[PDB]
Amino acid sequence: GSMITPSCQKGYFPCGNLTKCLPRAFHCDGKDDCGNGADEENCG
Numbered sequence: 001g002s003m004i005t006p007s008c009q010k011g012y013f014p015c016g017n018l019t020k021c022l023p024r025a026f027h028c029d030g031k032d033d034c035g036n037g038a039d040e041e042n043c044g
């Protein structure tokens with residue numbers, strides 16, 4: 001049993017597993033926003 005949850009609010013979202021939070025505009029901007037390989041998703 002493993003039910004992990006995020007640690008961010010509003011349009012912002014947690015950097016996958018990291019403790020970083022990206023803006024809502026991150027949604028398909030043009031390039032990486034996090035740097036770990038998580039925010040890249042949600043854009044193909």
Ligand SMILES: [Ca+2]
Nearest residue numbers: 031033039040
């Ligand atoms: Ca991105």
